[PDB]
Structure 1
Amino acid sequence: KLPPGWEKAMSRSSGRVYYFNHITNASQWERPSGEPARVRCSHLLVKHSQSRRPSSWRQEKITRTKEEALELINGYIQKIKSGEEDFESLASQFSDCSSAKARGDLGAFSRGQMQKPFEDASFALRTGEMSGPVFTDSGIHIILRTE
């Protein structure tokens, strides 16, 4: 009936149906559209105190909690979806990954090289599409599939 990982849901505040993806944590109002050996993605990572390594080029010692990291990820997604901010601009200023220097770009990758929640969400995105919060042992990611 629907592409991989999508399900219908109901808005609590409006009562309108929307669509949610349980692999990429994306959600949207309109019915979704329509696998490759490699995909190319960029991401914005916000680390927290239970990250596998709680440090980044932004902070010698990352102290925020998982919940606070999710709040920051959530706000970045809001500004991206309203057009007030561009994904690349936010990944460059605020991503806790060294790939901030490349506007969040990671290059092309195949299955079996990334942390697996990241991998599954990347390959479940369509080209040009962005995820919601995706959780790994590094922290919380926003993923943009560029190829």
Structure 2
Amino acid sequence: KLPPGWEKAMSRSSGRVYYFNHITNASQWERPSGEPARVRCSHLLVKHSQSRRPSSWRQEKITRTKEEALELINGYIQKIKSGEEDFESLASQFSDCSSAKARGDLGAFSRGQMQKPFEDASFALRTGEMSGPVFTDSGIHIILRTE
């Protein structure tokens, strides 16, 4: 019996089975196996032209499309997963959130405080686990649960 949130899938390019989480948008090859008052997370945000506030410390006027933002997110996830780059380094350089200055750290929080897709992903992640692309009214997030 798989844990809730998780489903079995089959690659497409290779035919090998993998597991996908529809709350975190994480995917992995191994069987996942398996809630607290509070969690601590970091994130990397890529905004797009339909973000609630299409502006950030990186760019006064953010004009990229949502599709372009998802491509950027997917590229950062690839480099993090390969070890070519660290999550903290990419967040500091490229997150459209002012938390970039703290390597993406948002600190600890409870349910009720964050936007719902962000909250649900954060609480479904295990400690140390990274999400896939998570969509909110702010943009597209990579979320790292640190505690």
Task: Give TM-score scaled by structure 2 length.
Answer: 0.99
The number of equivalent residue pairs is: 147
> Shift of the alpha carbon at 1:106?
0.1
Residue pairs, 1:1-147, within 5 angstroms: 1-147=1-147
Identity of matched residues, %: 100
**8 A contact 1:4–1:124 mirrored in 2:** no
> Shift of the alpha carbon at 1:30?
0.5
**8 A contact 1:52–1:138 mirrored in 2:** yes
Q: Deviations over 1:50-105 (max 9, x none)?
A: 00000000000000000000000000000000000000000000000000000000
Structure 1 runs (4+) deviating above 4 angstroms are none
> Shift of the alpha carbon at 1:3?
1.7
Q: What value does the CA root-mean-square deviation take over the aligned residues?
A: 0.4
Distance in 2, Cα, partners of 1:100 & 1:49: 20
Distance in 2, Cα, partners of 1:21 & 1:145: 15
Distance in 2, Cα, partners of 1:79 & 1:4: 28
Distance in 1, Cα, partners of 2:69 & 2:33: 31
Task: Give TM-score scaled by structure 1 length.
Answer: 0.99
Q: Deviations over 1:3-36 (max 9, x none)?
A: 2200000010000000000000000001003200
Aligned-partner SS, 1:43: strand
Distance in 2, Cα, partners of 1:33 & 1:73: 27
Distance in 2, Cα, partners of 1:98 & 1:123: 22
Distance in 2, Cα, partners of 1:10 & 1:83: 25
Aligned-partner SS, 1:96: coil
Distance in 1, Cα, partners of 2:85 & 2:99: 18
